[PDB]
């Protein structure tokens, strides 16, 4: 007897990896080899859509891209921001998935991994806009996107799954630059295997129009990734790379605060066991191969006393430190409350820690012990019970 109190639609938002439903030959980021999560939700009475923003781009850019995809229009990164980092101010044009948001409509956002930071930033911007963009618009007499005006609050809830709210120490790996792109390649091969196709036939658009970056005809991904490593999308502070780091996440937390008008839910993940003598953390059986061999070992043993990255930071889901996921803590004043049966707004409702890794939670990597269908159907039911 679920007391559904709202019929607000749901939009899915990926992390530093992710593509649209028309990409990767149909292999879904949200569902992977387990199925199509969006389809399951729609079939069960929950109108759901999928967003696709720049995977390697800054959370700010993604938020601007997300805004346009929701209400329609040309992406506007902000005159001040664009002049500050040296990339185009305008991007792609979208028809808009939910134009009714500009007229009283509300929406639920479910985000995975880095997508959780993006969702939080979208809310902050919608509610307060941006002074820097406002003040700059005056001085130079240029148009201003409504996103930076503030005063728009059509987001009802934000749910984050395995989000590095306080960053991830993976960024500190000595060869992180090459390892990060090997991860991108690992996902391409996983999709390619699932579809019985050569990974060279995959379609994966990184949406780097603002930087003038695009894979050239005939150019392989391997060659494209090499160009990316030396580009602003990897060497500037306006990148996912920077926002993923512990200090970048903290900088993010200083201004991106929880709105008192929206419900925040967070899900933590873990797939490692503790070593009795060493005290370090190791990958459990079943963790996707790339993480188990390349990432988890480092995540489960890297410490940094100067920054308080201690033994409580070693548990992880193969990509992000478990302690970073339940809510913003570093440089933040947001309140985190353990789920006690009732969801509260303006605070982070810690929904618990689940025994699944970073990719198993979205279905890209198998795990028969994880009833992924029930997990998401139960989440949708909870979001549908929230009163506006
Ligand atoms: Ca697995
Ligand atoms: Zn930017």
């Amino acid at each position: 007897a679920s007391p559904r109190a709202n019929d607000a639609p749901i939009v899915l938002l990926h992390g530093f990896t992710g593509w649209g439903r028309e990409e990767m030959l149909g292999f879904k980021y949200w569902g992977g080899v387990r199925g199509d999560i969006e389809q399951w939700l729609n079939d069960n009475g929950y109108r759901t859509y999928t967003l696709a923003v720049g995977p390697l781009s800054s959370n700010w850019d993604r938020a601007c891209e997300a805004y346009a995809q929701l209400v329609g229009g040309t992406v506007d990164y902000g005159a001040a921001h664009a002049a500050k980092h040296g990339h185009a101010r305008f991007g792609r044009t979208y028809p808009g998935l939910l134009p009714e948001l500009k007229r009283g409509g509300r929406v639920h956002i479910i985000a995975h991994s880095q997508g959780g930071q993006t969702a939080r930033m979208l809310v902050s911007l919608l509610e307060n806009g941006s002074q820097e963009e406002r003040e700059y618009a005056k001085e130079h007499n240029v148009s201003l996107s409504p996103l930076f005006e503030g005063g728009h609050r059509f987001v009802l809830s934000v749910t984050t799954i395995a989000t590095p709210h306080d960053g991830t120490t993976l960024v500190n790996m000595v060869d992180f630059t090459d390892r990060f792109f090997d991860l991108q390649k690992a996902v391409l091969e996983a999709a390619a295997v699932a579809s019985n196709a050569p990974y060279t036939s995959e379609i994966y658009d990184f949406k780097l129009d603002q930087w003038g970056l695009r894979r050239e005809p005939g150019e392989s991904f391997d060659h494209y990734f090499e160009r990316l490593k030396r580009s602003p999308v990897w060497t500037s502070t306006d990148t996912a790379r920077y926002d993923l780091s512990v200090p970048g996440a903290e900088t993010l937390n200083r201004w991106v605060k929880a709105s008192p008008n929206t419900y925040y839910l967070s899900f933590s993940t873990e797939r490692t066991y503790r070593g009795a003598l060493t005290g370090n953390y190791y990958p459990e059986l079943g963790m996707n191969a790339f993480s188990a061999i390349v990432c988890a070992p480092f995540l489960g043993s890297y410490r940094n006393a100067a920054l308080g990255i201690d033994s409580h930071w070693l548990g992880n889901d193969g990509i992000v430190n478990t302690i970073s996921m339940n809510g913003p803590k570093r440089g933040s004043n947001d309140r985190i409350v353990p789920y006690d049966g009732t969801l509260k707004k303006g605070v982070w409702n810690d929904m618990g820690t689940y025994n699944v890794d970073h990719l198993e939670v979205i279905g890209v990597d198998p795990n028969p012990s994880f009833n992924i269908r029930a997990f998401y159907l139960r989440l949708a039911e909870q979001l549908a019970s929230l009163r506006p």
Side-chain angles (χ1 to χ4, degrees):
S2 61
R4 177 198 266 279
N6 75 72
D7 295 293
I10 294 172
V11 301
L12 308 172
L13 186 60
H14 62 81
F16 53 78
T17 183
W19 48 91
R21 295 178 63 79
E22 303 182 304
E23 300 185 72
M24 290 285 215
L25 315 172
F27 180 76
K28 309 288 152 43
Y29 172 87
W30 283 100
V33 298
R34 303 300 292 277
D36 184 347
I37 294 175
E38 190 193 84
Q39 190 67 60
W40 295 336
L41 295 181
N42 280 306
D43 289 337
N44 282 277
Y46 305 98
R47 209 165 89 244
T48 305
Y49 305 90
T50 298
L51 294 176
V53 301
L56 306 186
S57 306
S58 70
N59 281 292
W60 172 282
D61 288 22
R62 310 174 115 225
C64 291
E65 282 163 30
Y67 174 71
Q69 284 183 48
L70 287 174
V71 304
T74 297
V75 180
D76 182 0
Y77 299 105
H81 177 99
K84 183 188 187 66
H85 301 95
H87 69 62
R89 175 191 171 185
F90 297 104
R92 301 187 181 181
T93 302
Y94 295 99
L97 296 170
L98 305 168
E100 58 273 31
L101 291 177
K102 316 182 84 303
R103 300 194 68 187
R106 305 295 283 296
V107 64
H108 295 109
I109 297 186
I110 292 170
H112 171 248
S113 184
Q114 194 170 59
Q117 290 176 302
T118 304
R120 285 168 50 210
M121 190 174 285
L122 182 61
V123 173
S124 294
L125 289 175
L126 284 172
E127 291 232 318
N128 313 304
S130 167
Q131 300 198 309
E132 186 179 358
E133 292 298 335
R134 284 200 290 282
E135 298 188 305
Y136 181 97
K138 301 174 184 177
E139 297 190 303
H140 304 61
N141 287 303
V142 296
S143 57
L144 177 69
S145 168
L147 175 64
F148 310 122
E149 283 168 37
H152 314 74
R153 50 211 61 185
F154 52 67
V155 180
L156 178 51
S157 72
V158 173
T159 299
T160 67
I161 307 175
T163 295
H165 289 297
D166 302 275
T168 169
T169 59
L170 183 60
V171 169
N172 295 294
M173 211 170 255
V174 179
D175 52 333
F176 176 63
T177 287
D178 296 323
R179 253 64 285 173
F180 182 80
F181 286 89
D182 283 332
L183 172 57
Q184 291 296 328
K185 193 167 185 296
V187 175
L188 277 169
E189 301 186 312
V193 164
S195 302
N196 292 293
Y199 93 85
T200 58
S201 297
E202 290 293 354
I203 301 181
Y204 188 11
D205 183 8
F206 283 70
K207 340 263 202 290
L208 296 172
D209 295 41
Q210 77 283 54
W211 295 106
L213 270 28
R214 305 178 185 184
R215 232 224 307 177
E216 294 299 297
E219 187 184 21
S220 57
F221 286 103
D222 311 64
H223 185 285
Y224 182 48
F225 294 170
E226 285 302 307
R227 285 169 52 207
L228 268 35
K229 297 174 177 177
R230 308 168 194 175
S231 68
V233 68
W234 197 254
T235 62
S236 75
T237 57
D238 186 44
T239 59
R241 170 183 188 191
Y242 178 63
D243 290 354
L244 274 185
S245 70
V246 168
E250 192 174 60
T251 294
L252 187 311
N253 293 342
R254 284 166 193 157
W255 68 278
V256 181
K257 312 176 178 182
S259 166
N261 308 305
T262 111
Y263 301 75
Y264 295 83
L265 290 69
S266 67
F267 285 87
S268 287
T269 53
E270 207 189 313
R271 203 76 156 72
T272 55
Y273 65 86
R274 181 176 182 293
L277 280 179
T278 183
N280 292 343
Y281 277 80
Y282 309 76
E284 296 179 329
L285 188 179
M287 178 183 276
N288 77 84
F290 186 76
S291 289
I293 301 170
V294 186
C295 309
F298 180 82
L299 270 41
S301 65
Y302 174 79
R303 298 176 176 63
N304 185 320
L307 304 188
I309 278 57
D310 57 16
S311 70
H312 302 90
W313 277 71
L314 311 181
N316 68 81
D317 73 353
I319 300 295
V320 174
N321 311 75
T322 304
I323 194 175
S324 176
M325 320 168 171
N326 74 321
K329 283 172 285 187
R330 294 202 168 202
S332 176
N333 284 301
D334 287 10
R335 299 204 310 133
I336 298 171
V337 176
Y339 179 53
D340 63 359
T342 74
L343 300 176
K344 302 147 189 174
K345 58 172 58 178
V347 303
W348 288 86
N349 294 274
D350 188 335
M351 303 297 95
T353 296
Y354 293 66
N355 187 34
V356 280
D357 80 32
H358 213 67
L359 302 182
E360 297 178 322
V361 76
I362 52 175
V364 174
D365 194 77
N367 184 337
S369 297
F370 177 53
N371 191 328
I372 186 168
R373 195 165 189 291
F375 179 82
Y376 287 96
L377 286 185
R378 181 179 315 179
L379 170 53
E381 184 180 3
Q382 282 167 159
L383 301 172
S385 72
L386 298 169
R387 292 191 61 181

